Every structure is written in structure tokens, then in C-alpha cells.
Amino acid sequence: GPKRGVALYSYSAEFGLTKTLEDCFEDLHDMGAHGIEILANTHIENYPYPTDEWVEKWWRLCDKYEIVPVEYGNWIDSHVLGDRDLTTEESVEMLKRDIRLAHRLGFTVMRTKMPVINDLLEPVENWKEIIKGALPLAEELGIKMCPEIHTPSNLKGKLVNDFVEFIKETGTKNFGLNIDFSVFRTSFDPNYTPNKPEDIIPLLPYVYCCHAKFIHMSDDFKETTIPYEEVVKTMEDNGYEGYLLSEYEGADKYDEGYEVGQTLRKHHILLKNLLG
Amino acid sequence: GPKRGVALYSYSAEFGLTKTLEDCFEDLHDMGAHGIEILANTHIENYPYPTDEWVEKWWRLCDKYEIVPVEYGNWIDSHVLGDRDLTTEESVEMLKRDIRLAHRLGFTVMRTKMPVINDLLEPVENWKEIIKGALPLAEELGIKMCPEIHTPSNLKGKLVNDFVEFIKETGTKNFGLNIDFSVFRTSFDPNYTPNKPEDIIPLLPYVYCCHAKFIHMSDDFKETTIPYEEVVKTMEDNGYEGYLLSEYEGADKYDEGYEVGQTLRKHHILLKNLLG
Amino acid sequence: GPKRGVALYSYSAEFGLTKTLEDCFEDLHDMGAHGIEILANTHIENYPYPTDEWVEKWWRLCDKYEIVPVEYGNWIDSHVLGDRDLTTEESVEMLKRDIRLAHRLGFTVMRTKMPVINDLLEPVENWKEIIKGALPLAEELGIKMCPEIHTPSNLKGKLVNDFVEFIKETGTKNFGLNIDFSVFRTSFDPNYTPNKPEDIIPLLPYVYCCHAKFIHMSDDFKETTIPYEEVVKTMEDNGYEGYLLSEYEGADKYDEGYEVGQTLRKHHILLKNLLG
Amino acid sequence: GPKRGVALYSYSAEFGLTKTLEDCFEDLHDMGAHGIEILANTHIENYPYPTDEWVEKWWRLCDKYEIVPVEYGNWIDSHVLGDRDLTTEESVEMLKRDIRLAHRLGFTVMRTKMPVINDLLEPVENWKEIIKGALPLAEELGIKMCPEIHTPSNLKGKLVNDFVEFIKETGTKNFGLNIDFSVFRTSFDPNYTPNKPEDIIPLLPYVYCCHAKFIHMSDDFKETTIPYEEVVKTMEDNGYEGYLLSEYEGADKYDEGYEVGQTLRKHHILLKNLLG
Amino acid sequence: MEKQVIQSVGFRNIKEITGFQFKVKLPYYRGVFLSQIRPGTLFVDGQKIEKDQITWTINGEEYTNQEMRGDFKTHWATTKPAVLKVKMPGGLAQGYHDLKYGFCFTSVNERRLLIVK
Amino acid sequence: MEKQVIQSVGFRNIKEITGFQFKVKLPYYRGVFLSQIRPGTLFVDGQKIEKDQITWTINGEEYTNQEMRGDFKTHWATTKPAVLKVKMPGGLAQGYHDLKYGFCFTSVNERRLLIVK
Amino acid sequence: MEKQVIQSVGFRNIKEITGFQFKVKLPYYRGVFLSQIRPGTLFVDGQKIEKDQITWTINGEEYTNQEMRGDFKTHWATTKPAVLKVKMPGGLAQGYHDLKYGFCFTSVNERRLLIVK
Amino acid sequence: MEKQVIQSVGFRNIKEITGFQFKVKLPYYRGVFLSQIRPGTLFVDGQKIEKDQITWTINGEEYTNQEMRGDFKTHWATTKPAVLKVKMPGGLAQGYHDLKYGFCFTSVNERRLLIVK
């Protein structure tokens, strides 16, 4: 069934200040959360060209703490320059570099963040050519590239359906979706309309990873703003066996004296109550 | 049954010149030889005080090449000084340091080389006090200390019987014997008399590791100077399940153009033919 | 004349949390403070057995930031054990290890903190034998061992005179005094009586380093509790050419949001106003 | 006057096998040869993206052995691909990366090897556009780019004159010549005609570094195939104050038991006899 | 690491569950030898656990109080927190626990932390 | 490093004194390429210093704004603060200075610091 | 490493056994980009294995000849031998094998080695 | 390093020139403690230099024979050659020198090398 882990973005206010990479690995090991999600532009040293010594250290860390590298978070920075947009070839070269790096660190899923052109979060007009230029390498290396479905997007809206039509047209097994649980938030944007858990059912074949986003955990180890119970039961009743990765985005992350590890421990107590 | 491995002493002419530690690990991995024997005064960096970074690198190397740390080769240097002999306390402190290091690198057996006072290879008069001062730590950490039985000593002689009487008197499970196969050599010292394989039978309860010493391997993958077939069949028929560690001591190790890895590959082809 | 620097003890609340060793070196470089005082049990990695790589990194740091290693702060831990006191030989071996390390890092002075037996801060009864066992090595290596004269001790009291009588008896050039400026504090212990600056005049031949201790710097870049002007003028008029090392000991070092670097910058603005 | 050094190409049969970078630095330090010439594609670790730690190690090595980084040897690989030639922009980006790296390691001269299209060693048709695209950065960083003048080219031939006309047209101070002394060889190719030392006189304004190539040193510390005395006297009489860098290219470099350090020591004994 | 003496990272049960562990950083401006450490008494949720049920892992090596008392060659650096392994059959229950550990050195800390089964 | 964007370490004059320098850490959860950086205007003690007087040293290499604008291959990691070298002949005077530096990135900070001559 | 171009370390079968692998060091005084490599034909015990059955692992990443032909950003250092993975179902038999591999670079080696099953 | 016991790298005069230095690797399969070393007599161009004129630098620290005789805690690794500093006022002359150094260890080497002034 669904496994669990942590997205190191939850340690964004701690990483490099009070937490090293090994401290984050040991923190994950404390909760029994063995799926890890890293951001390529944050957690890889000398990125985008890490040394062999750093890669061996990464593998030692993964072995020491029983960490499973699940999701490699990267960006397709087509708007990286200000004077122009990157050609398709440049974006494909950057994406292939990130694919080779993700595979070299043991990751199986890649959370590719595409650049948007509208405020409906529509991807660049050539996102299909970039993805199709990168798909042979991702297939040879066994990597699944997955754009994130985040608020305010809807599991029924046009963005999800464009991605799903692309998947059906190419017949690809290395391109899917990463569902952020914010699309289920029901306790507080004009374009946002809460999805019901069942709305994730026709997408589960293409869902390869999920961001177990939470907003506030109570001292009774309950999430207060998202129907976590119904969502997780829907996923585990319909044959989802990817990971749920805890991702905390609360502003109080940057408050003086905040312990994000305790919030993730509460969230994973909840996820243990739900998954078993 | 009996497993196999390599003693990195076979790479003594290559280590630090053309072979790193990782090259030795990969060489062992080529032959499928997964038991490793290291010498503490050779293969540990900044010995006797390796850094945490080096220990993590060692564990990464062991995981990457499926290496099993079997035997940690160390010396009780009671004659380390010239003006005097070390007190029992100094020797016990050195031995405890080596025990903690062996356990920290994952080793289970320690090949303790005792200093000799006669030419019958009799240990120092206080070897029992040193071993007994180190035995509580070795027991807490799960380390078995084992002096090597080498030529010209005899599996029936007085040295082996002193060690066996010590084992029976103390009733210890963390002190045994490391049998070097040179005590079986039958194809060429006055005090040497070849043992027959059956002579190892009354010692097998106390044998925790063996040095699969060879002298010359033929291109038909046969050892020419030791009855390897009878010896290994005797060990594997009487419930030996420690390791046989290939140890090459031939002078041609230091010849220009010698490939000791090919000789170890021949020896392990032989050991595979015998063990299965 | 008198040079200036910083004792990294001032960064005790920052070191290892928000400041690395290189950050401390760059902080010293900002103020133009080029004398450095380190604590052996704090700032040396894998102490007491640093690797060659760490020593080369230390020399690169000293060259990059024009740092002069002035004072190596160490302790004669004769009361390190609880069941007994260390023999003279053990203390001498520890001191020789610290001398070799201090010389290997380029330090010329060693601030040896002796263990005390009374509350008059009288050293152990065998401090002379320890110092005399270490003096040949300190002389061969060019190291000056110096116990610190701190409050409540008096530049006229029995402790300073015991050290000075030892220096005169042995006729040694590698044993002197490190004067902490707290013996001049006049703005707030029963045994303490403020010395006047002139009291440092008969000791200057044996003073090899000084701790420029301060208690509070005002925004006008003045020390408020110690006659810094008279003290520094006395030292620089009588041919002192060692270092004055800023040492901040205020409890507010550990306050949330305290910037000890700004306090040291104020203190060194003062020392620049005084030294020129 | 002219200084001396070594081009680490002389250690091509030793580097990475029996000589580390630090061994090469210490070898240079033995001879008093303080100019160093490195090849970017050989001696920089994780090239073309070395870590900050490696750069700090390089600076520690330069300080420890009093090495002056003189010449950074790089290649303009316009024919790096087989299907096409690199555009001018790609070559300029590679050259700018090499310029930034050369400046970051302290080098002042860059030996840019241009790709040739004829057998007269004529550079690619767009070498001027590449050099002119790189010249602003080389000028901002204080780097002098210099193509090597090697056999069979002539100090009077068309190649040298094209480079000199380019220098005069652009009026640039960051583009010059690296003269290999093989153009003076007189003791043994159809197109080769030995230059006389005076032929280097009209080029000395543009000569920023020279390869002190030698072919055979005698046990009397004399070069037998090149008029070294006349050449060096011509250079030092006409105000040359760049470096002469020993470069050994003899096939016996790869012979078993060859000591190239002893040959360089003979060559530098000669250069000391000549320069003083 | 963290400002607190008791670190939040590394607080977990030890597996059969034989007890738990937690990390303590040295609250001192210099490192100490193990013989200078005086381990005290742990209080987890008001329940007292005595000194003999706790071992100290420093530099990857585990020591009892008896072993530490005579160890003046092993150095506890201020930047490498010690791991403290407490023998408590069955370990800690899931949820919040109020740790109160006291120790000294020659020449008491509170923490509320979460356990996940 | 520190919590503030403008780091207190590395604030000093640049030597003849041609200006000064200060360090800024990236106030972002991921690293950015240099082409994504939008350097703004510095205000030292209310005096405005424009964008052209400031270069950015990242990974030991110095870049102008023109060079950074087209640099999408050089990566500014969040853990390695950028050095900003401001051309100001004569440098800063000794004592307190109120820095106010603003910059952005695609997809303003205050500090009171001391200068020592 | 070794003097020979074909290294003796790393010569083994690849596991179901899909082929084998061997290491080749760059016989050149400078490193090359992957686009400069011209992989040739392998001859194991006189049996010819063509270029398409061999991939090159460099810097821990595997490349086909098609991928290498257009790769002028990945650098093959002279000190880090390339791994060559040959597709040969069932792998090599135990015992001696005479490897003869040829390759070039822009601007043939023999070896007798042992396989252990 | 090299096959020979006396290394060619590091053979130079020591500066006023107080003598010279050379490197010797440990001709042994394991490292030894300094107390196990028995330094012998140096012969440079047939001229005998006795044991007292030679100090041993190991792990960056210099030891006399008296200091080494009682040093069973400092370890000489086989991969880190010892530096031997010979007191010889005026150092060695430029050109060829035939070194012959003998030493042993508990439980003689030749070399022709060049000096450059």
C-alpha cells in the first residue's frame, strides 16, 4: 500500500543553518519515514556537478538511515533568462542533466516544475517538446517525470486533462502526475474549488507520487484543514502504492524557536494511524 | 558452510602504489570473495585514530561491494620499545583500542599477533593477563580474538595446546584460533612436520577463521603444495562455517609486472570448485 | 609595539552553531585583528589527533586571512580522572602532545591552564616537574608556555611570584606569563584588589601574551570598567611587543540575537585608537 | 630577467600513477623552479567544475611550495564534435569558462591550443571571432591568451604573422605568443627550417611565455640539440622577463624505470647556469 | 545542531525494543575527556531512570559509566553530540514525552519531544 | 551563516581603498542561476549607490550585472552567500553604517554594521 | 591504477547474467569530452563484439555511442577509468579470456584476464 | 610514491644552508610505531654521516632518535614517507650524489640523485 516519507522542503528554514543533510536523514529515520524528496537546487552540493565523493556520501547516508530516494524535485527553467526564453534544446539538455543526476542518486520519480505563462498555471507552449526530448533518457534510466498538481488547479480542470491526454497520446510510462493534497483543502483564492477524494480515482493510474501537504496538526495528531482520512482511504482502496511525502509550508516555519521536526512527527503519527 | 574471502596482505606490494582501498574492495568483488581481512597498521587511515568521515567511507565501501569485514589483523606490540617491555596495562589499553576499532568497522574476528620470546613462537609470559584484561570488552562488543597458528607450529604442539587449555580454563567464547594452512604444506625448517587434515578436527570448535594460504596456483586452478581438497573437505564435513581467507606470501609479489589479483582469482576459482 | 588579535573564546556561543572556523578567521580579518588565540579542545578537528588534511586547511586559512597564530590555549588536566591524579609522566606526555600540535599549527605561545588545589588558585604541587619535563621540547620547537594570570590573583600576590621565581631559577626563555586585563578592573570577590597599570612593569620581561579582556564597550568605542588607556600606554612605553587578544566573557554572549562580532569590532576600534 | 619553471606535461607518464599534484609541486620546489604550467584537462579535479575545497587546496599547495602559476594550458575544442563544428558562441563560452578558471587559480597566461584545418597548422577560420569574444573577459581578469608556436612553424612564417597582425590590429595586451623552443632545434619534417635565436627578437614584445623544450640533456648538464645558450642570451638581452618552462616530450618518458624528475633537474641546472 | 542541550534529532526507540535513545550536546565552550563527564539521572515523564541504565555513544563507540570513569584519552567534542542509549524494555510509547536529563563535568536540561512507534 | 540576509562577516573596505564589500545570503528555499538574480540599489547611511557600482562574487568568480544577466549556467547555492563589492573611492568611514540593500529573483534588507579602518 | 589500458580490476560478469564489463583508462595526457571518444570493436577470445553491444559508464553515468557522440560537456578524466559494459547473454565463461579492445579519440590494446563465475 | 625506499622527490638542501633532506618510505607491509624504528648511518658520496646528525619528520612532526626511541604512540604509515633532515653545514653541492642509507625496524638502500643549488 501507500508508503510515507518527507519532502526536505519542510526543513527549508533549518537546512544549512541548524540542520545538515545527515540531520535531515536522521530526522526522517526517527519518524520511520523512509521516503525522501529532495530539491536539486538545494540539497546537492556543487550542483549541478556534484563530485563522486559527495555521491558516495549520499549513498552512505541513504544506507545508514534506510532512506529510500523517492522524488527528485527539479525545475524546467525556461524563463531562467530575462532577455529571451530557452530553446527547446537547452531545456532538454538541462532536463537530461537532472534526469541523469536523479538516477545517479537512486531516485525513481522526478517532480518537474514547469514554468507557467498564464495564471491558470498553464505550462509553456513547448512543454510537450521538452518532455518528449527527455522521455527516451528517462525511460532508459527508469525515471518517471511528474509535474505537480497544486492549488488552485483542479483534478477536473484543463491542466490535469492536458497532462492526461499527453500521457494517453504518447502511451508513456515515464510521465505522470504528482498530486499535492492542497487540492483537497476544505478549511481556510477565487479559482480554487475543493476536490472531493473520489476525484483522485480516475487519475490514480498516472499518479506516481503525492505531496502529503498539511497546514496545521493538532496535539491530538489530527490534520484540521484536509480530509486526510477519506483521501488516504481512497488512495489505498484503489491500489495506490506510491509515497505520501509530508510537506509543511506554514509561514511559522521561519518563526524563532519553531520545531518543524515535531510537526512532521505529529503528521507521521497521523499517517501511521491511517496507513498502518 | 565455509565462506571465502581475501586477506589484503596479498596486496602488500600493490597497496598504496597502484591499488587504493576501493580497488582492493572491487578486486574482491570481482572474484565474489566477500570476506575481507585487513591489517590495522596498514589499511586504516590516520591509524590508530581514524576520523568519522573515514569510517563512513569504509562503511560505504563495504556496502557498495558487498564486503563482509571478517578479520581485523592487529599486533600486541609488547616489544614495541627497546629499553623495556610494555606493562600489562599498556598492552591491554592498546588491545582495547584495537578491539573498539575492529568493532567500529564491523569486524567480528581479531587476528591478534602475539610477540614471541623463544623460537618455538612461545608468547610473552603475560599474554594470558593481556588477553584476560581485554576479554570483557571483546565480549561486550562481540569480538573474537584469535592468535594465528602458523608454520612451523604444529596443531599438536605445545603452543596450540596452551591456547586450547586457556580457552577451556576461562570457558571463553571470544578467544579462539586462526589456522594458517601452511601447517598442511607437503611440497617444498627443521621443526616443521606437515599436519594431516584430520589434525584440524579436535580444534574446529575453537577455530573462528582460517588463512587459506597458498604457495603456487597452476593454470589448471590447482594448488600444488597443500592438500587443499582434503583440508577443505575436512573443515566442511565437521561443521566449520567461518571464512577461508586467501593469503599470498610469495616473493614474486614484488616482481615487476606481477598481477597478484590473477593469482587470487585462480585461488578462488579453486575454492569455488571445492566449496560450491 | 603591541599588536592585536582575538581569542576565539569570544565566539564560544557562535562557534559550531552559526560560525565555522573560516567565519571566525574572516571576522578577525574584517577588524584587521591578525593575532588569533584558539582553544585546543574546541577549534581543532579530531583533537587531539588532527589529520594532515585538516592541518593543511588550517594553514590555508591562516594564509588567506593573514592570520598570525599567537596563542594556543590548552589545559594541564591533572585532575582529568576522578579516582586519582595523573602522574607527572602522564601530564608531561599530554603537554608534549599539545606542544607539538601548537608548533605544528604555527603557534608561538601556549596558554597552559594549570589545575588548582586551593581557592587562591595555587597550582598542583608538581606543576614545576610537569613544566620542566615539557621545557626541552618547548625550547627545541620555539614554544613559550604561559599560565594565565586572572582575577582574583594579584600581580603582586604569591602566585605571580612563584611563577617569576621559577623563571629566574630555571633561567628559561620558554616559560612566562599571560596577563588577563581583569586584574586591572576598577568598575563593578573578596580577594580581588585592582592593580594599577604600573604593577605590570616589573613583569613585562616575562609577559609573552595578554588577554585584552573587556566587560562592556560603549557606543563611543570606550571600555567602561578597565583603565585601558593607562594599561596600554604602560605596556607600549615599557617595550611590550606581544599581542593583546580581545576576550569577551559577558553572559549576554548567549543571549538571543547577540552579535559578539560587533562588540569585538568596538573593542578593536578602541585598541586601534590606543595602539595606532 | 627570465624566470624558470616546469610544465607538468613533463610528468605525463607519472601523474596519477606514481606522482600526485603535491608530488609535482614538491618536485618543482626541489629544483627551485617556481613557474608552473598545468593542463586544464589533466590537473584540475572534477574539471571543468572544481569544488571550492579543491581550489583552496590548490592555493595551499601554491603557498606551501612557493609555486607561481604561470601558464594555464587549455584547448579551443571547436572540432570536439564529429557531426559539426561548434558555433562561435559555444567556443567563446568554453573559452570564458577556461579564462575564469585560470584566473581563479592565479594563472596569468593561458596557452590556448587552437584547432587546425590544414597541415600548415592554420587555425580555424573563426579563431579571431572566438578570441575577440573572449578578450573582454581576459582583459577584465588580467589573463593573457597565447597560442603556442611549435614545430614545424617558423617565426617568420604565415602563422606567426597572422597572430602578430591580429595583435597589432586589435591593439590588445591580452593576446600574445607562447614560443616553443623546438623552433630552434638544429640536431636531429620537410616544412621545418631551424630559426636562429635572433629571429625571436621582433616577436619579444608579444611573447608572454616560452616552453623551454629540450630533447636530450647530457650528464654535463648541457642540451645537445638546441642552441640554448644563444637563445636564452638573446631573450635576456632584449628584455624578456616571462618564464621559461621546461617541457620534456621524449618517448622514453614512458620507459620502465625512467626518472623524468632527474632529467628536469639536469635541464634546470642548465637554466641556472644560463640565467643566474 | 540546536541551541538546546537535548537534541530533538535522534530521539527514538531502540530495536525487540530494548529501550530508547536521545542526543545531548556538550553545554561547554571546550571539549572534555570522557573521564570528566559525570552522568546523572534521567527523568522521562517524571519516571526516574538511573545512571546504570544509560550508556554513552561518543565517536561511534559505546561506553558505560564504569568505562567512561577511567577514559581520559577519548575526547568529546562540543560539535558532536553524544548519543545516550537508555535500557527500557518496551521502549517509549507514541506521543509526547517530557525528558529531564542532568549531567555535569569536572575541571539539568528539559525537553518535550515526540516518539513515533 | 546567519539569519539575516546581509551577513555581518565580510563587511570591510577593499584595498588604495577602492570601495567596500558585504555578504548577502540567498533568502530563498532553492538556489538560483545568476540570470535569475535582479540586483537592486544599495543605500549606505541613506546615500544611494546604484546597481552599476556593485559586482557579485559567486563561487569565487566576480560578475557584473551585464555578465549575470546572461548566465544561466552558474548556480548560486543558498548555503554560500554572495560577496558584493561596491566601488566607492575611499571606502567607508570607521564606525556604524546602516546598510539597506534590495534585490530580487525571478522564477529589501536592513543591517547596522561596524567598519574598522 | 595500472599501466595497461585495459584494467584487470572490474573485469566480471554482469547480473540473470546479461553480459560482462571491463575498465579502460584513457591512454592520453589530457582528459577528453565524450564526443571525442571513438569506441571501436571488442574481441574476446577472437570472437568479435561490435560497437553497439558496449556502453560506456563515465562519472557514474552510462552512455551509448549515440549519446556520447553529441556529449561535449561530460569530461573523461585520465585518472578515472571508464567502465565498458558489454551485452553478451550468459556472460563469459570461467577461466582465461584474451581481450582485445580498440578505441580512439579525436583532437588497440590486449589483455589476458581471468573470469570467476 | 615510488618503488625505491629512498624517494627522489624531496631531495634538496635545507636553508643559511644547514644541511639537506631526503624522503624514505617504509619498506614493510605494515606501519610501525616510532619506537620500532632503528635509524642507521647515512653515506653520501662515501662520506659517512652518523645517526645523531639526522632527524625524522613523520606526520609533520620532527623527532630525534632519543625522542623516537620512547615513542610508541606515533605511527609511521607505509603510505606516508618519512622526511630525514641531515645536519650538514653548507648542504650538498650541485650535481649527482650517491646516497646509501640503512635503517631497520623491530617486531640498506642506494640511490643516485641530483641536487640543484
Author numbering:
A (entry chain G), B (entry chain A), C (entry chain E), D (entry chain C): 8 to 195, 202 to 289
E (entry chain H), F (entry chain F), G (entry chain B), H (entry chain D): 1 to 15, 20 to 111, 139 to 148
From the paper:
Expectedly, our studies, such as co-expression, purification, and SEC-MALS analysis of DfgA and DfgB, revealed that DfgA-B formed an α4β4 heterooctamer in solution, as in the case of DgpB-C. To obtain more structural details of C-deglycosylation enzymes, and to examine the flexibility of the lid-domain and the loop regions in PuCGD and EuCGD, we also determined the structures of PuCGD and EuCGD at 2.85 and 2.54 Å resolution, respectively, using single-particle cryo-EM. The α4β4 heterooctamer structures of both enzymes were almost identical to those of the X-ray crystal structures (RMSD values 0.6 and 0.4 Å, respectively). These results suggested that open-to-closed conformational changes of the lid domain occurred upon substrate binding. Although the EuCGD complex did not possess a lid domain, the disordered loop regions would play a similar role in the active site formation. In contrast, EuCGD acted on C6-glycosylated compounds 3-5, but not on C8-glycosylated compounds 1 and 2.
DgpA catalyzes the oxidation of the glucoside moiety of puerarin to generate 3”-oxo-puerarin, in which the 3”-oxo-sugar moiety is cleaved by an unusual C-deglycosylation enzyme complex, which is an α4β4 heterooctamer of DgpB-C, to produce daidzein.
